[PDB]
Scaffold this active site. Structure first.
Site, PDB file in Angstrom:
ATOM      1  N   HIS A 119       1.005  -1.256   0.479  1.00  0.00           N
ATOM      2  CA  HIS A 119      -0.118  -0.433   0.253  1.00  0.00           C
ATOM      3  C   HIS A 119       1.070   1.813  -0.119  1.00  0.00           C
ATOM      4  CE1 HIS A 119      -3.120  -2.678   0.629  1.00  0.00           C
ATOM      5  NE2 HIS A 119      -2.125  -3.134   2.596  1.00  0.00           N
TER       6      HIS A 119
ATOM      7  N   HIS B 224       4.964   7.190   6.938  1.00  0.00           N
ATOM      8  CA  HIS B 224       5.122   6.064   5.623  1.00  0.00           C
ATOM      9  C   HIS B 224       4.107   7.897   4.449  1.00  0.00           C
ATOM     10  CE1 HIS B 224       1.022   6.189   7.918  1.00  0.00           C
ATOM     11  NE2 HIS B 224       1.063   6.778   6.086  1.00  0.00           N
TER      12      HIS B 224
ATOM     13  N   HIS C  98       1.872   9.069   1.029  1.00  0.00           N
ATOM     14  CA  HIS C  98       1.092   9.046   0.368  1.00  0.00           C
ATOM     15  C   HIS C  98       0.828   9.571  -0.664  1.00  0.00           C
ATOM     16  CE1 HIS C  98      -2.067   6.916   3.075  1.00  0.00           C
ATOM     17  NE2 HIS C  98      -1.304   7.666   3.757  1.00  0.00           N
TER      18      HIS C  98
ATOM     19  N   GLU D 113      -3.412  13.437   1.246  1.00  0.00           N
ATOM     20  CA  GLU D 113      -4.582  12.897   1.507  1.00  0.00           C
ATOM     21  C   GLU D 113      -5.462  14.274   2.048  1.00  0.00           C
ATOM     22  OE1 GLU D 113      -4.035   9.352   3.755  1.00  0.00           O
ATOM     23  OE2 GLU D 113      -4.800   8.570   1.901  1.00  0.00           O
TER      24      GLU D 113
ATOM     25  N   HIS E  31       2.826  10.917   6.648  1.00  0.00           N
ATOM     26  CA  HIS E  31       2.243  10.927   7.324  1.00  0.00           C
ATOM     27  C   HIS E  31       3.283  10.113   8.746  1.00  0.00           C
ATOM     28  CE1 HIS E  31      -1.652  10.531   5.195  1.00  0.00           C
ATOM     29  NE2 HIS E  31      -1.091  11.896   5.894  1.00  0.00           N
TER      30      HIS E  31
ATOM     31  N   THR F 148      -6.401   6.841   8.205  1.00  0.00           N
ATOM     32  CA  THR F 148      -6.791   6.678   5.909  1.00  0.00           C
ATOM     33  C   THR F 148      -6.534   5.686   5.719  1.00  0.00           C
ATOM     34  OG1 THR F 148      -4.836   7.833   5.274  1.00  0.00           O
ATOM     35  CG2 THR F 148      -5.678   9.660   6.703  1.00  0.00           C
TER      36      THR F 148
HETATM   37  C1  LIG Z   1      -8.255  -4.852  12.542  1.00  0.00           C
HETATM   38  O1  LIG Z   1      -6.953  -4.568  13.475  1.00  0.00           O
HETATM   39  C2  LIG Z   1      -6.166  -3.600  13.089  1.00  0.00           C
HETATM   40  C3  LIG Z   1      -6.412  -4.433  11.464  1.00  0.00           C
HETATM   41  C4  LIG Z   1      -4.860  -3.225  10.320  1.00  0.00           C
HETATM   42  O2  LIG Z   1      -4.933  -3.180   9.149  1.00  0.00           O
HETATM   43  C5  LIG Z   1      -6.134  -4.365   8.342  1.00  0.00           C
HETATM   44  C6  LIG Z   1      -3.767  -2.431  11.400  1.00  0.00           C
HETATM   45  C7  LIG Z   1      -3.193  -1.669  10.415  1.00  0.00           C
HETATM   46  C8  LIG Z   1      -2.761  -0.498  10.209  1.00  0.00           C
HETATM   47  C9  LIG Z   1      -1.691   0.348  10.553  1.00  0.00           C
HETATM   48  N1  LIG Z   1      -1.784   1.381  10.508  1.00  0.00           N
HETATM   49  C10 LIG Z   1      -1.750   2.928  10.042  1.00  0.00           C
HETATM   50  C11 LIG Z   1      -2.720   2.744   9.067  1.00  0.00           C
HETATM   51  C12 LIG Z   1      -3.292   4.024   8.853  1.00  0.00           C
HETATM   52  C13 LIG Z   1      -2.298   5.174   8.576  1.00  0.00           C
HETATM   53  S1  LIG Z   1      -2.395   6.649   8.547  1.00  0.00           S
HETATM   54  N2  LIG Z   1      -2.588   6.182   6.381  1.00  0.00           N
HETATM   55  O3  LIG Z   1      -1.726   8.055   8.885  1.00  0.00           O
HETATM   56  O4  LIG Z   1      -3.838   7.285   8.764  1.00  0.00           O
HETATM   57  C14 LIG Z   1      -1.269   4.843   9.788  1.00  0.00           C
HETATM   58  C15 LIG Z   1      -1.373   3.788  10.626  1.00  0.00           C
HETATM   59  C16 LIG Z   1      -1.319  -1.034  11.563  1.00  0.00           C
HETATM   60  O5  LIG Z   1      -0.393  -0.766  11.915  1.00  0.00           O
HETATM   61  O6  LIG Z   1      -1.781  -1.902  11.068  1.00  0.00           O
HETATM   62  C17 LIG Z   1      -4.277  -2.442  12.241  1.00  0.00           C
HETATM   63  C18 LIG Z   1      -5.055  -3.552  12.833  1.00  0.00           C
HETATM   64  O7  LIG Z   1      -5.080  -3.319  14.447  1.00  0.00           O
HETATM   65  C19 LIG Z   1      -3.380  -2.713  15.163  1.00  0.00           C
HETATM   66 ZN   LIG Z   2      -1.149   8.097   6.158  1.00  0.00          ZN
END
Ligand SMILES: COc1cc(OC)c([C@H]2C=C(Nc3ccc(S(N)(=O)=O)cc3)C(=O)O2)cc1OC
Ligand SMILES: [Zn+2]
Length: 258
Positions: free
Chosen positions: A62, A92, A94, A104, A117, A196
């Protein structure tokens, strides 16, 4: 048929597996600079990255994440809208297929070429997986990128991307200083929102810096040579990995500055 950014699995489809996609505090948003209110009670922002320990860079299919040792308070975000201490765990980006899109968040509907981010979790929940279950669990510091002069503090990231071209590839990425990615000013906008990407959890205090950083066309072109796909699968360039602006609903965006 897992989520992504294609016509068949992109942000318009996410609600089917992640219904919170249509929720009350989704991110990102458009920041209307004439509607955001100066809040004089916002404390100055404290970014304390001098003891930051970077470990690894990963292509997760991603984006790419630069991962930090968060097993102690080493690289922390405090102050501004935040209560207590938030530990840096990863950063990371986007980005777009062309310089006219990629961010975003938007500013008066303006789209930047990319958005950084820096992701922090609230230490009062003990671990990251616990923090994302809480409305005040994360703090993401968002920084816009525009195309112009090179960002010297970004070039170590750019030069490792050839080694993590495809999904699931990682490389050692020690001794990287994230202070090299910041702008001069810490003026910001803040609002309550979400992750996001799926799972889109409503756990984030967003802090979005007003001043963008400049990167060179050659730096962002190397982001666009990454792949969403695994090795020996059909090549799909990692571009346009951004979610569009979501409804603000019953939320107020607060400015740190007059
Ligand atoms: C349902 O539980 C989970 C599923 C899951 O992915 C499917 C996850 C994933 C998503 C995570 N983190 C993440 C996503 C977007 C941003 S942003 N773009 O800055 O907003 C910042 C961090 C992570 O570490 O891992 C984390 C989960 O729990 C910790
Ligand atoms: Zn992000």
């Amino acid at each position: 048929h897992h989520w992504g950014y294609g016509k068949h699995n992109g942000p318009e489809h996410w609600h089917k597996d992640f219904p919170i996609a249509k929720g009350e505090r989704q991110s990102p948003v458009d920041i209307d600079t004439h509607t955001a209110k100066y809040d004089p009670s916002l404390k100055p922002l404290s970014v304390s990255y001098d003891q930051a320990t970077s470990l690894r860079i990963l292509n997760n299919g991603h984006a790419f994440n630069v991962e930090f040792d968060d097993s102690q308070d080493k690289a922390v975000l405090k102050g501004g809208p935040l209560d207590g201490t938030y530990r840096l765990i990863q950063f990371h980006f986007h980005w777009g297929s062309l310089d006219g899109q990629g961010s975003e968040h938007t500013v008066d509907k303006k789209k930047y070429a990319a958005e950084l981010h820096l992701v922090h979790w609230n230490t009062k929940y003990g671990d990251f997986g616990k923090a994302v279950q809480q409305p005040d669990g994360l703090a993401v510091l968002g920084i816009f990128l525009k195309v112009g002069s090179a960002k010297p503090g970004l070039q170590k990231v750019v030069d490792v991307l050839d080694s993590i071209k495809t999904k699931g590839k990682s490389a050692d990425f020690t001794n990287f200083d994230p202070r090299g990615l910041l702008p001069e000013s810490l003026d910001y906008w803040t609002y309550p929102g979400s992750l996001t990407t799926p799972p889109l959890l409503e756990c984030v205090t967003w802090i979005v810096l007003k001043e963008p950083i400049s990167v060179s066309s050659e730096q962002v072109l190397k982001f666009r040579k990454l792949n969403f796909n695994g090795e020996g699968e059909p090549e799909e360039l990692m571009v346009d990995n951004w979610r569009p602006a979501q409804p603000l609903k019953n939320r107020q965006i607060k400015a740190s500055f007059k």
